[PDB]
Write a protein that binds this ligand. Structure first.
Ligand SMILES: Cn1cc(C2=C(c3cccc(NC[C@H](O)CO)c3)C(=O)NC2=O)c2cc(F)ccc21
Ligand SMILES: Cn1cc(C2=C(c3cccc(NC[C@H](O)CO)c3)C(=O)NC2=O)c2cc(F)ccc21
Lengths: 344, 344
């Protein structure tokens, strides 16, 4: 096995490069996110992911700029970055072996559903990572099961792939063509260019619904099919809601469809608190969607705040309450529900 | 087995309903297109598809309206329609057992590529179906391998699913959110609302490319990823090309990427005329795209006009030259290439 040694800049510290040696280098992925390698750090034995992309001549790397800012337990951390041979930017990242996508698929093909305790744990930790990035005004713009990494032993979840992520500035236009099939907020389907970070929340509501249902709640390979499914559940959007999504669309015909009672969407066993949470995430009107911090404080996650909760393997839960002031900034009073007595 | 008798209106003739008896009714599909049944006509023994959808109170059914107009050998024909019980519209359709989607998939996972004779036959016949519908000004808006039905013995291809099809009128706005992942013209990805029938042609170019490559040419679950793949091949769009796709998008950053020579996109054995055809289908500028009729007259399909061509199973080719005046209207002089000497 090759040992590769690079001079690399720590992700968030002061700009002081270090000689970093790594080995066991194999490709684990190859997509629009570029080539991703897994490797092992010679010093610590810790496994890392290395994401390598070609670095444009003219611009700054947006993903790097965003990742240098972030340090949170539910987001894959940028450990180091370095340049290599045309120039390549390499990001040395936390390695997390599983994904919500693969796990939901194991359960689905075994004709079982993910135990609700995992739904609570994973979704809670997704919402934390969202409260955190949204507090910088960063929108991920591609929340989907594949971007939710999991450790099966600790039940830690980390959000990954910040290749779409962008600081959203009010009044500054954003491309509508972000977000992946199944997970796109209706305003994106309509072509909104003035959407907010609440698209990440819609996407998370779709993930939650998917974990509860055992399949995507709004399937469709085209926006038209996706909208049909959304309307089957939410009912037809009002004139107001449509104009908000896209002002140029008020003229189009829209079948008058009645709302499907949210309880009937899901299986009979489904906790009513899970259903209530979905309904407050999957709202046509962006401002009517819960914030990630309010999602965390939702009663669906009450069980996680019980001092006696344990993982199915017997272990303690992962870190759920180490909220910072930055994390809490959107609504500091929520810290009362959020940080329970035993964790203070 | 149930024998069901309905009073149904013939698809395109005079409005004179007939008693139609069918049997062997089974569900073959269920999606946004509705429930689709296969069944057998008691009189003739012919297998049919029956597409059943809920009919809105307020409007006419647009699909019905379009299907009643069409009669073409490469389009699934509306034989009859009837109402049943709220009220359900039932379309009685040609039944065709296979799809380009399923066939490309058999070859793909056997690590073989579809023989080029089939690529010619299928693509030619797709383009005929498009020349035909476009001559009514009808745009299908969801050309994808799944909507290309095939008879494996006769190598006849029929376009199906007119659920998103629409007569496109200049100056009248159209929803952008049609077309399926992999097959969307960049103008749709950009949210164009003033696109033309030429999106169907982009989509067909993606199908051709897919059949030659063994996999989609522009994969991606988000428009972002799709555009990355499109740009990797076509080079970055010029300012003018962008402005045409969406006027509001001119200010956005766009990495300068060189065009990848079209010859290097495909495997080495790939016929040069197939590549030439692709590059004329997959153009940023909509009016730069070949018309379906011009696509049919392309040299890639020269082999189909050879008096000696046969199907691999020994049979004659299916009907390829019975062009009508309606079909030829976009460009009547093309009939000189299109209808070869032996076929006149
Ligand atoms: C399991 N796994 C973790 C990956 C990790 C990423 C990573 C980096 C960039 C993109 C993606 N995308 C999601 C990936 O495809 C998993 O579904 C993941 C990271 O930052 N840390 C990891 O452990 C990863 C990447 C892949 F390309 C393929 C599988 C991966
Ligand atoms: C093989 N096949 C032909 C189908 C036929 C359709 C039909 C009608 C409506 C939608 C679609 N969609 C494509 C289908 O899903 C096959 O990929 C196909 C038609 O008009 N004639 C047919 O023989 C069909 C429908 C299904 F739902 C599933 C499989 C089908």
């Amino acid at each position: 096995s090759k040992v590769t040694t690079v001079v690399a800049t720590p992700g968030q510290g002061p700009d002081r490069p270090q000689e970093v040696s790594y080995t066991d280098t194999k490709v684990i992925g190859n997509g629009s996110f570029g080539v991703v390698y897994q490797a092992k750090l010679c010093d610590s034995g810790e496994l890392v992911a290395i994401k390598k992309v070609l670095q444009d001549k003219r611009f700054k790397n947006r993903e790097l700029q965003i990742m240098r800012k972030l340090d949170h337990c539910n987001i894959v951390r940028l450990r180091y970055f370095f340049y290599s041979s045309e120039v390549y930017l390499n990001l040395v990242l936390d390695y997390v072996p599983e994904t919500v996508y693969r796990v939901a698929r194991h359960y689905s093909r075994a004709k079982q559903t993910l135990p609700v305790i995992y739904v609570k744990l994973y979704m809670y930790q997704l919402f934390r990572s969202l409260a955190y990035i949204h507090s910088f005004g960063i929108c991920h713009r591609d929340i989907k099961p594949q971007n939710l990494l999991l450790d099966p032993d600790t039940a830690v979840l980390k959000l990954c792939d910040f290749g779409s992520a962008k600081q959203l500035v009010r009044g500054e236009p954003n491309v509508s063509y972000i977000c992946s099939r199944y997970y796109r907020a209706p305003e994106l389907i309509f072509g909104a260019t003035d959407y907010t970070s609440s698209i990440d929340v819609w996407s998370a509501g779709c993930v939650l619904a998917e974990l509860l249902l055992g399949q995507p709640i709004f399937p469709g390979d085209s926006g038209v099919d996706q909208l049909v499914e959304i309307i089957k559940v939410l009912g037809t959007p009002t004139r107001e809601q449509i104009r908000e999504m896209n002002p140029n669309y008020t003229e189009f015909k829209f079948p008058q469809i009645k709302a499907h009672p949210w309880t009937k969407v899901f299986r009979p066993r489904t906790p009513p608190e899970a259903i209530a949470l979905c309904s407050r995430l999957l709202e046509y009107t962006p401002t009517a969607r819960l914030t990630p911090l309010e999602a965390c404080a939702h009663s669906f996650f009450d069980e996680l705040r019980d001092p006696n909760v344990k993982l199915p393997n017997g272990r303690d839960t992962p870190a759920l309450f180490n909220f910072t002031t930055q994390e809490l900034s959107s609504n500091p009073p929520l810290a009362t529900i959020l940080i329970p007595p035993h964790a203070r």
